[PDB]
């Protein structure tokens, strides 16, 4: 599923991400835009052989099991395919663990390079929330 901007904002708000660990809603929408272009089915392979999955491009090296990343962890206790669903629940629940692990949203390279320090509230402007 390819979300609209305000559609995804409302879904993320109704999963508890607004100001989660101090990150306002616009931060999450901005991250999803540049990680996946709002597409739940996005996948990308990394040089080390791990793969990033879903709307927030969660990495199989640490967070989910895809059966082909030897020596990796599954800290969110889920198959990586669950992160590609049109229902964003699994992605949101796993993102909450990632952002709580000490490094905040710097875990998402696109957030650090394209959202951090910008007017992220622009990403939810005009949306009814
Ligand atoms: Cl915001
Ligand atoms: Cl933080
Ligand atoms: Na894994």
UniProtKB/Swiss-Prot annotation:
Catalysed reaction equations from the record: Hydrolysis of (1->4)-beta-linkages between N-acetylmuramic acid and N-acetyl-D-glucosamine residues in a peptidoglycan and between N-acetyl-D-glucosamine residues in chitodextrins
GO molecular function: beta-N-acetylglucosaminidase activity; identical protein binding; lysozyme activity
Positions annotated to bind substrate: 101
SS bonds (residue pairs): 6-127, 30-115, 64-80, 76-94
Tagged with keyword Hydrolase: yes
EC number per UniProt: 3.2.1.17
Catalytic-site annotation from UniProt: 35, 52
GO CC, one annotated term: cytoplasm
Residue stretches making up the C-type lysozyme domain: 1-129
Pfam families (alphabetical): Lys (PF00062)
Keywords, alphabetical: Allergen, Antimicrobial, Bacteriolytic enzyme, Disulfide bond, Glycosidase, Hydrolase, Secreted, Signal
Single GO BP term: defense response to bacterium
Further comment found in the protein's record: Lysozyme C is capable of both hydrolysis and transglycosylation; it also shows a slight esterase activity. It acts rapidly on both peptide-substituted and unsubstituted peptidoglycan, and slowly on chitin oligosaccharides.
Subunit comment: Monomer.
Protein name: Lysozyme C
Natural source organism: Gallus gallus (Chicken)
Gene that produces this protein: LYZ
